[PDB]
Amino acid sequence: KLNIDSIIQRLLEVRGSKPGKNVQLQENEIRGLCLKSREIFLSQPILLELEAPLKICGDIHGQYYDLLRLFEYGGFPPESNYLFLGDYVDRGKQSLETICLLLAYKIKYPENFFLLRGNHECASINRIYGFYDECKRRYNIKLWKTFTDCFNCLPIAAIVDEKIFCCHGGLSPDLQSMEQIRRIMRPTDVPDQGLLCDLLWSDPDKDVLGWGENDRGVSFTFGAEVVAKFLHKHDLDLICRAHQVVEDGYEFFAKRQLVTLFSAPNYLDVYNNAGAMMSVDETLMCSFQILKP
């Protein structure tokens, strides 16, 4: 009953309009996007096994027109396949248009479009950093809770061609086998510290080789040795994550065993960072497409 094509049409109708122009979908349409995508998320693994070619994107944080710029540069679905690493809402001015377009494409192209969970796809987080307020203003809190129920079902990681491990934050001192991830049950809010918490919040740190203290006030930091042990144990070549703002949109850490992607140019209007998107072809060759602010 949900008219996906009309929703997409209206959402894309603003590409070319003055940045900031809102697209106000009906409440029933947004709830449908949430309920239908949730079903698909639960129907697919929590640890996705994808194949190149694919375009991987980092944080978007409600910068809708920048999301439109990414698609125009990388190709609107289904021209290209996409994998987003999380943090779709909060901070930006248009989290609603942003998340709705993404859910809409997930429903429209369930086998060629994927979305991972970021720490901002968490109630306790998006309640404070913007999304809740945006829903309260343009719609209502009940709709916000519907979004939360959808987010609690997002997959947590993906492996591209058995070589690239993708997640939002990073590793966990609790992560020993890939099975541990695959066994995580949904829906789930992340109520306790531990594996899922770390996957959503950890960061690589240049100072320590093993495990360190995280300035975020949650989770930990991990060094090059930790990364090395992980990659070899699971026969992987690289970790692709997001979660941290980087100047060039992308940046390597842990002696190039990990790459961080961030796709929200000029973050919060304060940073003058660029946004980036990483393209991976069938020859498992990695390439970066930058998006200047």
Ligand X SMILES: C=C1[C@@H](O)[C@@H]2O[C@]3(CC[C@H](/C=C/[C@@H](C)[C@@H]4CC(C)=C[C@@]5(O[C@H](C[C@@](C)(O)C(=O)O)CC[C@H]5O)O4)O3)CC[C@H]2O[C@@H]1[C@@H](O)C[C@H](C)[C@H]1O[C@@]2(CCCCO2)CC[C@H]1C
CB of 270 to ligand X, least distance (A): 4
Kindly list the residues in this chain that would bind Mn ion in the complex (CB under 5 A): 59, 87, 118-119, 243
Does position 290 interact with ligand X (CB under 6 A)? The reply is no
Which tokens go with 69?
């710029």
Closest by CA position to 37, among listed 147, 132, 121: 147
- Whether residue 234 is annotated as binding a ligand: the answer is no
Distance separating alpha carbons of residues 211 and 221, to the nearest angstrom? 6
Q: Among 12-20, 21-29, 70-78, 210-218, which window interacts with ligand X (CB under 6 A)?
A: 210-218
Distance separating alpha carbons of residues 184 and 73, to the nearest angstrom? 35
Determine phi and psi for 60, rounding to 5 degrees. Answer: -120, -35
- Residues 113-172 contacting ligand X, CB under 6 A: 124-125, 129
Of Mn ion, ligand X, none, which one does residue 243 interact with (CB within 5 to 8 Å by kind)? Answer: Mn ion
- Whether residue 59 is annotated as binding a ligand: the answer is yes
What CA–CA distances, in Å, run from 168 to 18, 79, 118, 224, 243?
A: 31, 25, 5, 18, 6
Residue of 18, 192, 235, 270 interacting with ligand X (CB under 6 A): 270
Count the site residues for ligand X by CB under 6 A. 11
What letter represents residue 166's amino acid? Answer: C
Of ligand X, Mn ion, none, which one does residue 211 interact with (CB within 5 to 8 Å by kind)? Answer: none
Does position 245 interact with ligand X (CB under 6 A)? The reply is yes
Toward Mn ion, which CB reaches closer, 97 or 203?
A: 203
Of Mn ion, ligand X, none, which one does residue 87 interact with (CB within 5 to 8 Å by kind)? Answer: Mn ion
Distance separating alpha carbons of residues 113 and 159, to the nearest angstrom? 14
Relative orientation angle of helices 27-43 and 95-108, to the nearest 10 degrees: 50
CB of 57 to Mn ion, least distance (A): 12
What CA–CA distances, in Å, run from 286 to 56, 115, 181, 237?
A: 10, 20, 25, 12
Does position 218 interact with ligand X (CB under 6 A)? The reply is yes
What CA–CA distances, in Å, run from 1 to 88, 153, 183, 188?
A: 26, 22, 33, 28
CB of 28 to Mn ion, least distance (A): 30
Residue of 42, 141, 268, 290 interacting with ligand X (CB under 6 A): 268
- Whether residue 61 is annotated as binding a ligand: the answer is yes
Of Mn ion, ligand X, none, which one does residue 93 interact with (CB within 5 to 8 Å by kind)? Answer: none
Count, residues in the chain: 293
Whether 7 contacts 97, CB under 8 Å: no
Active site residue 232: no
Q: Which helix (H) or strand (E) holds 259?
A: strand 258-261
| Residue in 31, 106, 117, 120 annotated catalytic | 120
List interacting residues with ligand X (CB under 6 A).
91, 124-125, 129, 215-218, 245, 268, 270
List binding-site positions for Mn(2+): 59, 61, 87, 119, 168, 243
